[PDB]
Design a protein around this motif. Structure first.
Motif, PDB file in Angstrom:
ATOM      1  N   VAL A 153      52.772  22.822-120.467  1.00  0.00           N
ATOM      2  CA  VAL A 153      53.928  22.359-121.209  1.00  0.00           C
ATOM      3  C   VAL A 153      53.620  21.735-122.567  1.00  0.00           C
ATOM      4  N   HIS A 154      52.395  21.876-123.077  1.00  0.00           N
ATOM      5  CA  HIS A 154      52.083  21.289-124.372  1.00  0.00           C
ATOM      6  C   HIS A 154      51.024  22.083-125.115  1.00  0.00           C
ATOM      7  N   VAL A 155      51.455  23.069-125.899  1.00  0.00           N
ATOM      8  CA  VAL A 155      50.519  23.837-126.711  1.00  0.00           C
ATOM      9  C   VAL A 155      51.020  23.925-128.135  1.00  0.00           C
ATOM     10  N   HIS A 156      50.074  24.015-129.071  1.00  0.00           N
ATOM     11  CA  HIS A 156      50.360  24.257-130.483  1.00  0.00           C
ATOM     12  C   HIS A 156      49.837  25.649-130.814  1.00  0.00           C
ATOM     13  N   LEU A 157      50.730  26.600-131.071  1.00  0.00           N
ATOM     14  CA  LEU A 157      50.315  27.983-131.306  1.00  0.00           C
ATOM     15  C   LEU A 157      50.323  28.391-132.772  1.00  0.00           C
ATOM     16  N   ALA A 182      55.653  25.697-126.426  1.00  0.00           N
ATOM     17  CA  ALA A 182      55.033  25.550-127.745  1.00  0.00           C
ATOM     18  C   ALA A 182      55.714  24.488-128.611  1.00  0.00           C
ATOM     19  N   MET A 183      54.891  23.637-129.212  1.00  0.00           N
ATOM     20  CA  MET A 183      55.364  22.519-130.006  1.00  0.00           C
ATOM     21  C   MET A 183      55.883  22.920-131.384  1.00  0.00           C
ATOM     22  N   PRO A 184      56.732  22.069-131.984  1.00  0.00           N
ATOM     23  CA  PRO A 184      57.521  22.473-133.157  1.00  0.00           C
ATOM     24  C   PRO A 184      56.908  22.130-134.508  1.00  0.00           C
ATOM     25  N   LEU A 210      63.381  18.625-126.518  1.00  0.00           N
ATOM     26  CA  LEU A 210      63.239  17.992-127.822  1.00  0.00           C
ATOM     27  C   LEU A 210      61.944  17.164-127.845  1.00  0.00           C
ATOM     28  N   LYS A 211      61.137  17.367-128.892  1.00  0.00           N
ATOM     29  CA  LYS A 211      59.983  16.680-129.178  1.00  0.00           C
ATOM     30  C   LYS A 211      60.108  15.618-130.112  1.00  0.00           C
ATOM     31  N   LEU A 212      59.757  14.385-129.747  1.00  0.00           N
ATOM     32  CA  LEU A 212      59.720  13.259-130.686  1.00  0.00           C
ATOM     33  C   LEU A 212      58.272  12.904-130.997  1.00  0.00           C
ATOM     34  N   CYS A 257      53.968  12.429-123.393  1.00  0.00           N
ATOM     35  CA  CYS A 257      52.887  13.388-123.607  1.00  0.00           C
ATOM     36  C   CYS A 257      51.525  12.712-123.517  1.00  0.00           C
ATOM     37  N   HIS A 258      50.518  13.533-123.208  1.00  0.00           N
ATOM     38  CA  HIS A 258      49.095  13.175-123.220  1.00  0.00           C
ATOM     39  C   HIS A 258      48.800  11.672-123.120  1.00  0.00           C
ATOM     40  N   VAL A 259      48.950  11.150-121.913  1.00  0.00           N
ATOM     41  CA  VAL A 259      48.600   9.767-121.666  1.00  0.00           C
ATOM     42  C   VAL A 259      47.065   9.686-121.666  1.00  0.00           C
ATOM     43  N   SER A 314      47.470  20.866-121.867  1.00  0.00           N
ATOM     44  CA  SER A 314      46.247  20.874-122.652  1.00  0.00           C
ATOM     45  C   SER A 314      46.337  20.118-123.973  1.00  0.00           C
ATOM     46  N   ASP A 315      47.521  20.045-124.562  1.00  0.00           N
ATOM     47  CA  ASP A 315      47.642  19.736-125.996  1.00  0.00           C
ATOM     48  C   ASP A 315      46.676  20.608-126.787  1.00  0.00           C
ATOM     49  N   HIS A 316      46.689  21.898-126.466  1.00  0.00           N
ATOM     50  CA  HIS A 316      45.948  22.890-127.229  1.00  0.00           C
ATOM     51  C   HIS A 316      46.349  22.777-128.693  1.00  0.00           C
TER      52      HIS A 316
HETATM   53 ZN   LIG Z   1      50.604  18.028-129.316  1.00  0.00          ZN
END
Ligand SMILES: [Zn+2]
Ligand SMILES: [Zn+2]
Ligand SMILES: [Zn+2]
Ligand SMILES: [Zn+2]
Ligand SMILES: [Zn+2]
Ligand SMILES: [Zn+2]
Ligand SMILES: [Zn+2]
Ligand SMILES: [Zn+2]
Lengths: 362, 362
Positions: free
Chosen positions: A11-15, A43-45, A96-98, A154-156, A226-228
């Motif tokens: 649920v957390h990738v940057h493509l 995919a993140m915005p 929604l991403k903050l 996200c990513h604690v 992952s926060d890829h």
């Molecule tokens: Zn991220």
């Protein structure tokens, strides 16, 4: 003796598409996902243009539909200008991403009142996730309570953060969270090896005590993600290194190694990479989809994994046990032993599936 | 035609004794208080040594009893080491101070978990106040809710902060706040005149929009308090200027000017400098105590006020209307027209008065 797993979800990738395609694109990033046993990504915005309005979302959707090899949903990003404008497209997004800490000019929020405005205007049945470090975790939880809805952190990365979330859960507050593999398997002790450029990540690598606190509080962690965050080696080793690690190809092998060592169970892993992502984000099942892994195979992570355009990895030199052998996605062989066998465009926007709409009252 | 006011209370002063007595001491700071129409002060714990344990509190109490000219209570300060150790002396203090942003080594807290520990261990009937800026306001409010008790927010300085507190009050949360005169009467527009050294203060001066938001939301402000934070001109104009403004001698004249202009009423002023300080901090009445002010007298603030050892003021050049003519404290003339007429040591620790103990269940 392979083990069959369901289709795993990150649920957390940057493509990086649109606008950063030298770092990664939908086709390369989703190849990386498949090779890591991941069949669906969110995919993140923070692309260029950033996905902060309907036209940018429309563009990104078509780029993903044409390039993605696995299935996906796309986040919208909160900005200082778009609260109250996303209602017609909100349901088509992952959530929604903050971005509540650093950020580029466009996702930067300068006041907690802007956070409140987003929590008040975004449809209350749809997901909100936040990049929220240290005290920001407590601050966004307060905003969530004021507006009487849930939030996903996200990513604690820190003992401080996981204990705060643990306390909130004990008070019955609707908060969930995810943890990324680098915060479980790397620490300050690795910074000498990585160097200051490669080592740049947000949230930063924690102390040994931070890492140990995350493991000890596994029960509090709802998801792994992952926060890829791919960037090229030139960028990571240059004068203003951007934060982030690639991670799609290494996440599952790292976690399988931990399962083999008895640090968590197979079920613990599958709750966190399949069932909880589904339920928090209302992501639909993927028919005829599974991942076959070999739990016996010992290998050492190389200087770069085969697929991500990042072409480097902070896990280089770590010994792992477990590898992805085969991935079947919606009835087609998508990956076998180092080769991706579905083309760019095979992947679909799960929010367009009838099962992929988030339920809401009339 | 003078007006008789009750003895006014400033719940946020830095009197610098022990350890910073070139900047101010109990005798000079309380002379400044009396000249500003203030008969009771609550002194902050960031002295040298800092008031973070029983022996330091004992020392500070005796220094105050010997030096103070008006009545007082002394705050304890939260540290990374003292949660759960202050129980026997807690009731003798004004309250507990949490410094949640910058700070010196000793009041510095590095984790929200340390804040939680203080909220859990400090007696629940006793005051807690926090230096908490921007998102930190939301974070400490979350901690207060998790621990199901109240909190008081020091020197609210921004539109962001006052609106957050307003929203919390609308949800029935037990939060109170104070505002300092520099955040009502100075802004970014004054930084050119002040310069970067004199202008250094925490919270920093706000925009015109911040100032206007505080005035528009006067109903949300429970107290005025000066954050009297004296430093010498040499320090303010030097290479590493410490943050803070002196303010005891200018607070009431500034606010009286605003009353004369119809910006708030006399009652609004007296709720915020008398009744609300009493009730939030459970400070006792002062018998036979009053302040006589002349509302007609127009004057211009000079380059330094007579009493504070700071020997400078950021309000230099502002035109005010209203001045303190006479102060009577517990039946003795304490101040008349530029002369303080009670000696160092006249002042008393109000927490030692029978009426000054905070009520608690057996
Ligand atoms: Zn991220
Ligand atoms: Zn992030
Ligand atoms: Zn996330
Ligand atoms: Zn299952
Ligand atoms: Zn302060
Ligand atoms: Zn205060
Ligand atoms: Zn202060
Ligand atoms: Zn009254």
């Amino acid at each position: 003796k392979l083990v069959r797993l369901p289709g795993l979800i990150d649920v957390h990738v940057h493509l990086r598409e649109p606008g950063g395609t030298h770092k990664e694109d939908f086709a390369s990033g989703t190849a990386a996902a498949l090779a890591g046993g991941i069949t669906m990504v969110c995919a993140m915005p923070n692309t260029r243009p950033p996905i902060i309005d309907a036209p940018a979302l429309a563009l990104a959707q078509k780029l993903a539909e044409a390039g993605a090899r696995c299935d996906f949903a796309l986040f919208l990003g909160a900005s200082s200008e778009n609260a109250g404008t996303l209602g017609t497209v909100a349901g088509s997004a992952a959530g929604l991403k903050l971005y509540l800490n650093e950020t580029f000019s466009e996702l930067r929020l300068d006041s907690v009142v802007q956070w409140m405005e987003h929590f008040e205007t975004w449809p209350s049945h749809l997901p909100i996730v936040a990049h929220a470090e240290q005290q920001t975790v407590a601050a966004v939880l307060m905003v969530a309570q004021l507006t009487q809805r849930s939030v996903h952190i996200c990513h604690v990365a820190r003992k401080e953060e996981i204990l705060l979330i643990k306390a909130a859960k004990a008070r019955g507050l609707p908060v969930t969270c995810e943890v990324a593999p680098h915060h479980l398997f790397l620490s300050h002790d690795d910074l000498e090896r990585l160097g200051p450029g490669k080592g740049e990540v947000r949230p930063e690598l924690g102390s040994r005590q931070d890492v140990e606190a995350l493991w000890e509080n596994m029960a509090v962690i709802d998801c792994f993600a992952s926060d890829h965050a791919p960037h090229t080696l030139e960028e990571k080793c240059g004068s203003r290194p951007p934060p982030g690690f690639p991670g799609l190809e290494t996440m599952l092998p790292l976690l399988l190694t931990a399962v083999s060592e008895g640090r968590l169970s197979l079920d613990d892993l599958l709750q966190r990479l399949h069932h909880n992502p589904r339920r928090i984000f209302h992501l639909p099942p993927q028919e005829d989809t599974y991942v076959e892994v070999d739990l016996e195979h010992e290998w050492t992570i190389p200087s770069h994994m085969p697929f991500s355009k990042a072409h480097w990895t902070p896990f280089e030199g770590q010994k792992v046990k477990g590898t992805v052998r085969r991935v079947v996605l919606r009835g087609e062989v998508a990956y076998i032993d180092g080769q991706v066998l579905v083309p760019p465009g095979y992947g679909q926007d799960v929010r367009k599936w009838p099962q992929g709409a988030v339920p809401q009252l009339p």
